[PDB]
């Protein structure tokens, strides 16, 4: 689970190729699901973000 504002980072196309980081990560890790949750936009109440595995 990742913050919804971090989906743009994983969609970057990798240098000198036509495939993105998310596709490579999914190819190397088969059977793992990725979802986005707004509750992770602020965990401590002061603006800190977080990721949950």
């Amino acid at each position: 689970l990742i913050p919804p504002s971090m989906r743009k980072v994983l969609a970057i196309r990798m240098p000198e190729t036509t495939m993105s980081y998310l596709d490579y990560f999914k190819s190397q890790n088969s059977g793992i699901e990725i979802d986005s949750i707004a509750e992770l936009e602020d965990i401590d109440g002061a603006g800190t973000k977080g990721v949950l595995v």
Binding site: I2, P4, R7, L10, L22, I34, D35, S36, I37, A38, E39
Partner: protein, 156 residues
């Protein structure tokens, strides 16, 4: 593509709203005189009729004793100035006992059980010149650019 879900919370209260279902008392045999009354602000009594029974109320003024606080109603209130007001010459729901959300103009949260002080216009203020029997109940929140405070009213 990664699916996303969002979340949002409602507000806690509105000005003039009854706080909770504890023992309360509403005095509905009241009439507004000489002006308009804002919901969530204290009122005073200018004359109690000896035979007819109605009480004449208006907004709070310097050197006067407050009686109660007007409450919200979707049938007895007129929508003027982009908010609810009680117009002159109409019946008003005045609460004289219980917990209520009230308009405030202070900057610091109050302490539980301390005495309530009012301003000249009828809104709560930490250093007001009007003394009241009422106490603080602990609620302290903020609607969109509006401060609110939880107040416990005892029967006069």
């Amino acid at each position: 593509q990664i699916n996303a879900s969002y979340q949002r919370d409602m507000a806690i209260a509105l000005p003039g709203m009854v706080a909770d279902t504890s023992k309360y008392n509403i005095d509905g045999a009241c009439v507004v005189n000489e002006g308009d009354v804002l919901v969530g602000a204290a009122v005073q009594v200018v004359q109690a009729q000896a035979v007819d029974g109605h009480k004449l109320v208006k907004a709070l003024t310097t050197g006067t004793t407050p009686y109660g606080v007007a409450i919200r109603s979707h049938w007895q209130t007129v929508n003027a100035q982009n908010q609810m007001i009680y117009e002159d010459g109409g019946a008003i729901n005045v609460m004289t006992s219980g917990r209520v959300w009230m308009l405030s103009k202070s900057t610091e949260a109050p302490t539980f059980g301390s005495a309530v002080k009012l301003d000249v216009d009828g809104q709560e203020k930490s250093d007001g010149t009007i003394e009241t029997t009422w106490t603080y109940a602990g609620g302290w929140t903020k609607y969109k650019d509006i401060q609110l405070v939880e107040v416990q009213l005892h029967q006069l």
